[PDB]
Design a protein around this ligand. Structure first.
Ligand SMILES: CCn1c(=O)c(=O)[nH]c2cc(C(=O)N[C@H](c3cccc(F)c3)c3nccn3C)ccc21
Length: 113
């Protein structure tokens, strides 16, 4: 129960804050199926920050939980696909950790609305 415009402004800011934690920009765009041809065999719902931005502007995030769930998919897809001894896997762990405080603070701002 709140106004749409300030909520979307908050989500845009939050998405930027999350992307700032991905310094190598490895989560910025869809995993390229031309370089990773078997990716969809194991990952049923790919996600990345560009797709999240598209979803945001298409009004697909009208609650904080749905936004946070797509962020969690970026992380969990990467943990699932990649071996534990890779930079990718460790980057997903780090993103999960650093994203946590970002999301907790942003959710508090949504609740304030
Ligand atoms: C973390 C999400 N992620 C995975 O989780 C995963 O398993 N494989 C991934 C593979 C790529 C990937 O191929 N990057 C290349 C690349 C290499 C160097 C710079 C640059 F900008 C892009 C590339 N893109 C298109 C063509 N080329 C070669 C990206 C993410 C991936």
């Amino acid at each position: 129960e709140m106004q749409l415009t300030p909520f979307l402004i908050l989500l845009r800011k939050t998405l930027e804050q999350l992307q700032e934690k991905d310094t190598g920009n490895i989560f910025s765009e869809p995993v390229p199926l031309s370089e990773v041809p078997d990716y969809l065999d194991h990952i049923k719902k790919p996600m990345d920050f560009f797709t999240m931005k598209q979803n945001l502007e298409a009004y697909r995030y009208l609650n904080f939980d749905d936004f946070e769930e797509d962020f969690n998919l970026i992380v969990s897809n990467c943990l699932k696909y990649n071996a534990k001894d890779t930079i990718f896997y460790r980057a997903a762990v780090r993103l999960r950790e650093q994203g946590g405080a970002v999301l907790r603070q942003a959710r508090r701002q949504a609740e304030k609305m």
